[PDB]
Amino acid sequence: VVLQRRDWENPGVTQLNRLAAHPPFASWRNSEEARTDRPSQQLRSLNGEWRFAWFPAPEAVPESWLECDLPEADTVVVPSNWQMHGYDAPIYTNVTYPITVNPPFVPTENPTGCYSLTFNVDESWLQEGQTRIIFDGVNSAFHLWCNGRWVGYGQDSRLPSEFDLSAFLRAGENRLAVMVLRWSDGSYLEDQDMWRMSGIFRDVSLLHKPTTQISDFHVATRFNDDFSRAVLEAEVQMCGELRDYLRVTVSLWQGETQVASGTAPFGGEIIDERGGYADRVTLRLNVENPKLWSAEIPNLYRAVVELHTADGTLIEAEACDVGFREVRIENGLLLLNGKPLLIRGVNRHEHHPLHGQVMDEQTMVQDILLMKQNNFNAVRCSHYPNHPLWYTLCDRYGLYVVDEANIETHGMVPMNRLTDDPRWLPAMSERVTRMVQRDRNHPSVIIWSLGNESGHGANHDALYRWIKSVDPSRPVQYEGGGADTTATDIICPMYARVDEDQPFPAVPKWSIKKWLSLPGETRPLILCEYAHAMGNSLGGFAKYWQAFRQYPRLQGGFVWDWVDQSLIKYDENGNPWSAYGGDFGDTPNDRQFCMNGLVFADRTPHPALTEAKHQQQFFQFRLSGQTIEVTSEYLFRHSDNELLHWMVALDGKPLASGEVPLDVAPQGKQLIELPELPQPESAGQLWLTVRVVQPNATAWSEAGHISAWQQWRLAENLSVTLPAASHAIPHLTTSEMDFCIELGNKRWQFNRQSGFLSQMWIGDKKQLLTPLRDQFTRAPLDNDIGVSEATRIDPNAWVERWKAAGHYQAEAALLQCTADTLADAVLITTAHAWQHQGKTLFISRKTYRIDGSGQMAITVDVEVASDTPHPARIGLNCQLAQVAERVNWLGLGPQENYPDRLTAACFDRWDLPLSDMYTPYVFPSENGLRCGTRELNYGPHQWRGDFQFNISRYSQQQLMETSHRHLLHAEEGTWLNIDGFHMGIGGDDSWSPSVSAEFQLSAGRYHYQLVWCQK
Amino acid sequence: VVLQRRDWENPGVTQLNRLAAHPPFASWRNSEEARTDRPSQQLRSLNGEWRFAWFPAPEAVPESWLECDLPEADTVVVPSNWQMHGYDAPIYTNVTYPITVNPPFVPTENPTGCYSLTFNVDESWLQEGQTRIIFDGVNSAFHLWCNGRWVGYGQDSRLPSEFDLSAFLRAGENRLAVMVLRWSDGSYLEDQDMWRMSGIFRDVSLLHKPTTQISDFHVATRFNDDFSRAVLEAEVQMCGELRDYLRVTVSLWQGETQVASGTAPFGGEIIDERGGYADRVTLRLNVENPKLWSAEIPNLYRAVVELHTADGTLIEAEACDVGFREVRIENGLLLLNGKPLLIRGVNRHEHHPLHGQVMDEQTMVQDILLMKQNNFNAVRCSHYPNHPLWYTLCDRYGLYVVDEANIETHGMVPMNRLTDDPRWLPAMSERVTRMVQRDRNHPSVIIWSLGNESGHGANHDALYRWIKSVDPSRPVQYEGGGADTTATDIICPMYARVDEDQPFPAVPKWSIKKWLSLPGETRPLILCEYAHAMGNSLGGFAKYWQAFRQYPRLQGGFVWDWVDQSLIKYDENGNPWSAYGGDFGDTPNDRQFCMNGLV
């Protein structure tokens, strides 16, 4: 009968015998237990060891399995995904569906997981009341049997399914059987860009309720004009037999103090011509001076709802956390508690590198702490409802949540083929209505979303209107169909740029400043995705934050995204390594496109995370003379856990220091006057640095946490002292093959055929393994490669333009190599031309001046053909012979920084182990650059100038040829790249050229100089 | 397997294997035939004599009935209601449901009608193409078998159900079996004040289409400021295999004269980031000085849609009647073709004293003539979609139509118990979406209605918005929940008085002059029911007509109602007499309250 109906290939059947959706219940039988949130005896977990067998299709499952255990089944932990235990491969695909597109049919080869559990039920559970089983998430569809008898069917992987088991359970031993299908007609609605996995991946519980029970309750808060008086409105519904003696009490607690209370019999007000709801009641509770909930100060109350008799015998209690806050759109602005929000948001997927899509408390808490420590206030549930514990932790720690329906049909052509079709309106409505019914009581949820990337169809407008009518208290947003349709209260583009338009047919992406002012437009604009964090990325991030602060109706956005979705594999020696699409034999697949996070899958930060922290800070600073103005960007809190540290330094050396407490009202200013600063004798630039420190621990941070910082140049004294005249003169030797210069124990050799410095000796120890040569290329970054789908190549991507022009293959030809003795120096002059099939790309003219002090001054002038694509860099590289433990530099740091991502970095003297100067991105690329550098020390060498550098054990050629970080091997010696100039990295998106014109090397002529000496 | 699933007690299953809804098709294989509206060889009627047996429940039907005819079955005419042949009693109840209210369950004693037909299919129908069966209305739910094999299931009594029979038919003799249930979970949505009857009560047809076919088409008309230039916009969709040589032509005819024409290959404009519809095409035809449709002068054109090859071989044609008119609400007034309407309307049920709820051409024509001879210009389909011929006759003779979804839950307490519940949103959406997809091309339909007497729930606001988005060309109205909710473009009270207020709790009936001017109110007001014509009645009628003429935003209303719903019984001498509720042993019942007509 079950394989006869094939309910998984039928969009009109989304469930059989499933109970209504409701807020989370524990059925306490004691009000004190409910108030203090203690564990309930009536709610029993079935997590643990279950039996499991895998089958290639549902027709291959033996009939005996319903009756009793299969001999060849294994013991496995629930919750889990079965791909993580090795039964079949996880599939990573972005847009293309992982099955043939033939809606609503799915392949006959439909992998099937059979789970089963034997468990004991207590005798008191069968005498009276209702027993239900709850599956918090099953992917993608399943049938359930209890003691051999069929119970029901469910679809939608991301919301709980509940079934009544009262008529199926017996005293003693019981057996559940659950058959889970990988594919169903629900799969057409679940095309998110993520690993496709399956199984029972969220918790399983039994819940015991009495026959007369609370079946639903809703909480709402209404305010006066100044938020000094609130009304809590609770609506309660019951199921079972109505009696005259039944009563409902709602009490409101703040800690241990009862703050409000109300009691009533059942019976709503008249609703229409036929009467009202006999089985419902509304309580109104007045609260004076309520403490308001926000992400800055997450004040919660506890509401307890009791069903009891008139004589006062308790039947059951339920409870939730309540926050008083009002969200609304007024005159084009999104307001919380009367103030305009600025969203510092990120998109987050539920992902764990060992457990796949199984989430636990420990990982959720780790994410929330790291988010708040980096100045995030908001999270977008991309793109499905989360584990129910997630919303509780966002209520307690304080994050705003955007809660999103599990609907994405990206792989359809056109994108709205299903969402414009009335036969799929039933399936889509279950995904939205059940999410709102589960989550409507959480204060942290402030916006509902209709899904992601499904075009714009009439089913979207209908569901938009359904939510506005059942829940008027939250705005609704939807990005599909060009980001400003009639199904959204907020304009919510993805990857729109700050200043540049992208005029695509039908769905243009205006620049964000222009979009606000299109004729007729009045809504606020919040980007649902911006700043694609794929690999070495977030260039141009500061330009979004400058716009968000200047324009009132630009209210921020959600970065894409929090955590890299990589998985762990083991090699032959059992060493773990990070894997991406294609590494499991999954095909077709979309390769590294699954790794887009600010943090690695193990929750270690990428260098871009510090850039986000700095642009999102809650204190802004200005300097005028000796005065710092501090401006608070808090909306609700006074700065009561904040002190300002300032320091004045001269080229790294500290000169003066101090601290000042911060006493600044929300949205206010404070002026801090600095002491008379010292006048130093010596040459150099003075630097002032301020940092805001939190002296006391919070729920989310340690004592000493740095929350904000800023650096300025003060007075500069230029150096007018001429170098001391030495008595030694460098000696020049000319052979046919070489110029050699000697001075003491030091020796330099220049090859007369190649025209480069080929060797240096200190004593009799060689210093180079490779000559010092010009470099114009970089191992390309993900933003340079410019691919979102592995099958589709963009000929406008930087890496395509550089390969076509021959930048990676260009050969140096020598034009000139000459040597001359001056009075106190030897001068070497060289010129080279880089050519590819007749065309000259670059010319480089160089002088080397070696004086009596030992210092070698290098001067470089480069010309770049105006019709070649602009180069990625202009500098020198070589392979040094020695490996040292430390790197010491005077310049921006201490983390990796690039010309379009250097606002977070500070000028100072930095000292790190060599291994910290390499960023281990899983897909290897150019990495580890430090800009604005004046001095670099490594072993005996010192370089001085005004340059960017990177230093490591991997060549640019090795990083370009290697697809995975675990396959890189350290080379002999150390590779040094020293650049006079370096292109930006981009990252407005990663599938089209995104470097802004002010970060391209387009000048045509370039000059820089270095001194190389031995300290 | 069929009595194991019990699909009739489950609001989440409204159909199995039913094809998509679409405007009426005849599949002509010749453009001239399509233009002149001649009978199609590809559309075959199965009306006539069928076999029929009655059973007290679905579990009492013998298994043999699927294979072959029962000996104790009778010969009966289809279409019919089985209560009119004496198999059980018709029930007249106004508000109270005729079953125990226990949604979604129905009684186990669920009278069951088993119909069957033996018929011949021509050999050319099985070689190529698709063959479908169409039931225009079955009350209330049914399973269908062909040659012993289960085909599908449908609910909603008032809209067509279609099933593909290509894989089930054989050459020579075929047998259909249809098992019809009186009660289903669909009955909770069908609580209209009328006789409760059952059976196959509208036509049954076979339709033959080619494998590559026109699957849907829509017609829309846009105008300049003075109605001197129009654009006819036709959207056409196909099913089957896309080829480069396929083309669509739309021509527009006024009598014998071709007036406009356009041709194109398949391929819509870009819609979004993934492209456009490869299997759709939009033609735009310009028309100068079009003759405008109205109820006073019902000027029609004929649109012919041909699917053909580039060399000009015709694959199939479809056609409809087109009227050029614009309906809109502007500054609080309902305008047709730029002028403010005054609705002289009546509510009409499909009722015949001998045949029950079976409608025929002759009775429809008799009603329309009497309506127009008595100065009516408008009719409200109370409270369900009509027989498809009704809309064609209102196009040709000139009446405005309000077309209403088959949803009424009057007997619930409170009235919005189902329509405020998201688990019934699937069932309700099928009733609205399939009606709009069937009727959107008729010029006579000028307003959509969401149903009748179902309170006001969130399912109403969602469906209101669904229609405004798929069909912006007609206003939407809904009376429930106090007549002026967010689910209506028109204030549409029932039985509000001219000068006197009726201040009921939650749902007051203001007098109509006062309602127009409540702070914030800007919509026009048209009474969806007024002046109850029960017996010796219509006193005070002149006072409504005086108000309608004096106030611009009072634009008329629909009288309740056209025809008395009485039935014929026979005495001992065989003399016919008119019967009302209770005269068939039906109990409980609401007595003479079923007779409310002007005729």
Ligand SMILES: OC[C@H]1NC[C@H](O)[C@@H](O)[C@H]1O
């Ligand atoms: O990584 C690209 C990014 N683009 C937009 C989508 O919403 C995300 O799921 C993701 O696919």
Ligand SMILES: OC[C@H]1NC[C@H](O)[C@@H](O)[C@H]1O
């Ligand atoms: O005859 C009373 C009348 N009242 C209003 C209803 O809509 C009609 O169906 C009818 O019941």
Ligand SMILES: [Mg+2]
């Ligand atoms: Mg996508």
Ligand SMILES: [Mg+2]
């Ligand atoms: Mg009624």
